[PDB]
């Protein structure tokens, strides 16, 4: 089980040519406020 390879699942907006992002904040997929770490409509920025 190779579980070290990850990528992005939701993003606020598209990147630029040759631009790098290492963000880890949780994405607010819904419009509700999301705090702490875990909640509904906001679970994880990346996926393996």
């Amino acid at each position: 089980g190779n579980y070290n390879y990850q990528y992005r699942l939701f993003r606020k907006s598209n990147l630029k040519p040759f631009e790098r992002d290492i963000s880890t904040e949780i994405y607010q997929a819904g419009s509700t406020p999301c705090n702490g770490v875990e909640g509904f409509n906001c679970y994880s920025p990346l996926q393996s």
Partner: protein
Amino acid sequence: NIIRGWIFGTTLDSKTQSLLIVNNATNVVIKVCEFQFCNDPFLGVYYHK
């Protein structure tokens, strides 16, 4: 040599990649790294007679 360098970023506190020029009297160095910064940071010099 009052001015020394510059910083560049979008939020400049410990969560986004940030760029930093500091120009010492010796060879200048450029870095592109994450960083955290003070409220009013600078490189205060002291006179030496």
